Amino acid sequence: DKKTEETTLLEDRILTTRNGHTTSTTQSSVGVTFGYATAEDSTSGPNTSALETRVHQAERFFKMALFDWVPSQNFGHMHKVVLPHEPKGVYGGLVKSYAYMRNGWDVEVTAVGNQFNGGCLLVALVPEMGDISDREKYQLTLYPHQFINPRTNMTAHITVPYVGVNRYDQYKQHRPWTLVVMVVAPLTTNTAGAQQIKVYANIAPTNVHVAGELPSKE
Amino acid sequence: DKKTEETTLLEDRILTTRNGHTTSTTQSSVGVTFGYATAEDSTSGPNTSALETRVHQAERFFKMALFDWVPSQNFGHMHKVVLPHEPKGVYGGLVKSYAYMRNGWDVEVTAVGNQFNGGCLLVALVPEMGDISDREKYQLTLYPHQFINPRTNMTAHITVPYVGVNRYDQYKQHRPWTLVVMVVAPLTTNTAGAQQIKVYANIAPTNVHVAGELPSKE
Amino acid sequence: TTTTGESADPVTTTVENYGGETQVQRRHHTDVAFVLDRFVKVTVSDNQHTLDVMQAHKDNIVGALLRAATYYFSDLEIAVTHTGKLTWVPNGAPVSALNNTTNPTAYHKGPVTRLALPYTAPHRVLATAYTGAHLPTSFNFGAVKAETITELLVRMKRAELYCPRPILPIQPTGDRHKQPLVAPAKQ
Amino acid sequence: GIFPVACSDGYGNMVTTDPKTADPAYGKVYNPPRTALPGRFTNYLDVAEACPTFLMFENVPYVSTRTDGQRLLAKFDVSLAAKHMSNTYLAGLAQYYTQYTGTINLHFMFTGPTDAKARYMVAYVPPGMDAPDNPEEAAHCIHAEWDTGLNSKFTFSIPYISAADYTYTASHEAETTCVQGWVCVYQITHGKADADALVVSASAGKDFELRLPVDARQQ
Amino acid sequence: SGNTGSIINNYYMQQYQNSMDTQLGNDWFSKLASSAFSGLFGALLA
Amino acid sequence: SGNTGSIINNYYMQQYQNSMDTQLGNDWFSKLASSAFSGLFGALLA
Amino acid sequence: SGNTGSIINNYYMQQYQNSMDTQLGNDWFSKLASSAFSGLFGALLA
C-alpha cells in the first residue's frame, strides 16, 4: 500500500478493506498476509448432495475485543481464541438454522497505541491449535502471521481459507481456526508512549456456505 | 538516495556501501561527497619501474572510534586524526612488507544520536593538514566535507583519492590524509534528545597499490 | 537487505550480497514423500491393534516429521511379526469382524508378514491435531488381529502433507549439544 | 549359470483375499450351455434400485392413520442399522460394507378406500436439533407434502448431507443420536381415512453407493 | 473380472485354468434398474 | 515417488496396489518459498 | 567395471544401487607409462 503528499512525519501506506456494507480504512498498513492458499477448494462437494447455498449477507465485518497489552506481560504472553466463538447477527443466525457449514476468515487485528511505544506483538491464525508448549511458541511463524510493531504499524491483516478434514463442518463442535496474539518484545512505554494498548479485532466470515436446514421453534 | 512505502514518520534515503566482503547499510544517507576528483592519476608511474602491484584484499572496511560529542564542547571543538594511524589486519600487513605504497579513502563517519537532538557536526578530509588557526576553522568547507545534523542525518560519507607530491609514499613517515570532525553548533539535548553522542568511523583504503618488497624475519 | 519486517513476506538473501556465490542443492532427502516412506515400529500391546500412524514415537523421524504437518494423506504398508492367522479389517468395521477369516487374512510365513493396504478413512484427508485434545474414532487405517502379535511396523506410501506445525530438537544444557558420533576403532 | 533370484521375506503368505489364481489340474472341461437364462443380475445395487422392500413399524410394513389432524405417523433414524430398516433388502445388503454415500428412496403407497382422503408430509431432519413432533416445526427442513388421488404411490429421496464424503452403514456404541438425522412422516389431515394403511418401502437411489466389504457377523 | 489383478497373463492355458463354456442359440436387472421412471407425472409450478 | 526404486513395473494392477484418488473441481509452500525477496531495497555503491 | 558380469541390467535403479557422483569444473599413470622413452639415444651399427 502507499500514500502521496510526499513524505511527512505522520503515517501513510493507506488501505481500505470492505466486506458487505462495512469498510475499514487504515493509514498504517503493512499489507495483508494470505493464508495457505489464494482460493478455497470446491465449495460444492458430494457430501452435500449439492443442496448447499451461500449467504452474501453473512460476509460482513463484526468486532470483538481481545485484551490489554501492558509492560508487565513479557515474552510468550499469549491470548488465543477459536473462531467463531459466540457469534451474533446474521452470521450467528446461520449456525442455529443449518446443520453443516463452512467459511474462511478475514482478520484485521488492531493494537492502537502510539509511535513512541517500543515492543512488538505477533498475530497468527492456526489450524487445529491444541495448546502449544513454551518452546514451540518460537516456531509460531509457521502459521499465517503478521507483526504489529509501534514504530511501524498499528494494524495487522491476515486473510485465510476454510480448512478441515471435512468439506463442511458443524461449528457447534469443531472449528478449525484459532486466532492467537503473542507478545514477543514486551511493551515499552518510555517518556511519551501510551500507558497500555487496547487490542481489538475486526473480522469477516469469508465465502460462507451452509447446508442442511434444521427444524425450528421460533 | 531514496526509499519507498510512501512518506512516513521515520527515515528513508537508504544506501548500502560495499568494499570487499564488508557492507554498510544506512537508512538516513544524505549522499556521498566526492574528493578532489573521480579517479586517481596513473597508478603505474616510472618511479616504480613498474614493479608495483595492487591488493584487492586490503580494500575492505575497518572500524575505529573518534570521540563522544557532548553539549559541553561548543563551536570549533575539533577532533583530528591522520589516516592510516595504527593499521591492523591485511591492510596493516602491507605497511610492514612494502617500502612504498598508495591508496585513497572511503570514509563513512557515523554519529548516532536521535532526531530530537539539535546541534551539528562538520566532517572533512584534509591534504597535508598542519594545525589550523581558530579563524581558519571558518573556511574548513574548502575541503571534501559533509555535515551531520540530527534533524536530518546520522551518517556522513565522503570518498577521496590518494594525493601527494609523490606518486607513491612511505606511510611510515608521511600520510597526506587527515580526517577531522568539528562542532559547528553545540549539541542540543532538549527533552528527549540523547544525552551524548558516540562518534565512530567506517573506513576502507581504496585502490591500494604497493611496491618494493622488503626483507623479513617473521 | 532491509525489509519491512512486519510484512511477514518471505525474504532470503544470498552470499552474493557480499561477493560470494550461491551453489546448488539436491534436497532429495528433505522430500516429504520420501522421508516418510520407511518403516517405523509401533508399540502393540494386545494381540489385536487398531492401525494408527499417530502411534509412532513423537521423536522418531517419521512420527516427528508426520507431526510437523497438520493434515495428511497416505496409503499404508505394514510388517507384522505374528503367530497364527493375521486378519485385517477396514476403517469403520465392527470390531467383531477381526475374528472372521473371509476378511483379508494372511496365514503364517515367518518371520514377518508384509502387506499393502489402501487409505481407508471416509474423510478427504486425516489430521495430526484437532480442536473439536483426543483424535476422532474414524482417524484410522483399519485394525489387525492375530493369535499373537510380537511386533508391528508401518510404512506411509504416497504421503501428502498440509500446513506445517513446529518440530523441536533437544534443548542443550551448555552452549551446544555435544555427543558420541560414529567413529572408527581407535587402534 | 542359472538365473539368480532373491526370495523376499514377508512375501508369499497365503491370504484369503489375494488377487491371484491357483494353478490348475483337471483341464479340458466344457460347460453345458447357459445362454439366455432369465433373471441374471450383475451388481447387487441394481436389484436394490429396482425392487424397493418394506420398512417395519412393530411387525407391520404400513403406518396407520391414528385419527384426523396433525399427527406424527412415524419418525426414525437414518442408518442402515435402524430398526425400521431391518427387514429391508437395502439393510440386509449394507451389512457387509463399512461405508456408503448416496440417496435413499422412500415410497408411500396409500391403501385406503375410494372415499378415504388424506394429506401427508415427509421431511428429513438433519442432526443438530431434535426431531420435531409437528409439521410447523418440521416445515423448515427439506420436506414434501402431498395428497391422495388416482396415484397410490409417492416416492421421495433422502439426501446424503454429511460432513464427510462417506459414512458408516454400521452404528457405533458411542453414538446416542443417529449420526445422519432422521426422517419423520406426518399426516396433515384426512377425512374418512382413519384406520387406513399407508404402506412404505425403500429402494436404493441412483447415486447410492456401497463400499469397503467386510465380514462381521457370527461365523 | 472378479477379485483378480495380475497384469501379466496366466502361465497356463485358459483351457486348463478354467472350464470352457459352450453357447447354444449383458443382462436383466441391470436393464430393469435403468427403465425406472424418474420424472414427476404431474405439472410443475415455479 | 517416495523411497521406491524398482525399474520394472508392479506385477499387480495399480487399482489393487493403491487406492485410486478421485478429483473434484503443484503446490504452495513451494510457490511461497520462491516468491521471497532477495535484492537489496537500498541503492548500492561500489 | 569391476568384478561384475551379469548381462542383464540391475532390477533396481542406479540411483539406489549406487551413490551418484557430481562433477565440478582417463587418467595419469596410464599417460605417464606411455610417455616412456624406448629407443636407443645412440647411433646404431649393423
Automatic annotation (TrEMBL), chains A, B:
Official protein name in the record: Genome polyprotein
Span covered, complete protein: 287 to 504 of 2328
Family to which the UniProt record says this protein belongs: Belongs to the picornaviruses polyprotein family.
Domain of life from the UniProt record: Viruses
Subunit composition and interactions: Interacts with RNA-dependent RNA polymerase; this interaction allows 3B-3 to act as a primer.
Compartment annotation: Host cytoplasmic vesicle membrane; Host endoplasmic reticulum membrane; Host nucleus; Virion
Functional description taken from the UniProt entry: Cysteine protease that generates mature viral proteins from the precursor polyprotein. In addition to its proteolytic activity, binds to viral RNA and thus influences viral genome replication. RNA and substrate bind cooperatively to the protease. Lies on the inner surface of the capsid shell. After binding to the host receptor, the capsid undergoes conformational changes. Capsid protein VP4 is released, capsid protein VP1 N-terminus is externalized, and together, they shape a pore in the host membrane through which the viral genome is translocated into the host cell cytoplasm. After genome has been released, the channel shrinks.
Coiled-coil features, chain-numbered ranges: none
TrEMBL record, chain C:
Top-rank taxon: Viruses
An MF annotation (GO) of this entry: structural molecule activity
GO biological process: symbiont entry into host cell; virion attachment to host cell
GO cellular component assignments: host cell; viral capsid
UniProt-listed SUPFAM superfamilies: Positive stranded ssRNA viruses
Localisation per UniProt entry: Host cell; Virion
Statement: the UniProt record of this protein carries the keyword Transferase: no
Pfam families xrefs: Rhv
Alphabetically ordered keywords of this record: Capsid protein, Host-virus interaction, Viral attachment to host cell, Virion, Virus entry into host cell
Domain Picornavirus capsid: 1-132
Protein name as annotated: Genome polyprotein
Native source species: Foot-and-mouth disease virus
TrEMBL record, chains E, F, G:
Lineage: superkingdom: Viruses
Localization per Swiss-Prot or TrEMBL: Host cytoplasm; Virion
Function noted in UniProt: Lies on the inner surface of the capsid shell. After binding to the host receptor, the capsid undergoes conformational changes. Capsid protein VP4 is released, capsid protein VP1 N-terminus is externalized, and together, they shape a pore in the host membrane through which the viral genome is translocated into the host cell cytoplasm. After genome has been released, the channel shrinks.
Protein name: Genome polyprotein
Organism: Foot-and-mouth disease virus serotype O
Complete-protein stretch covered: 15 to 85 of 736
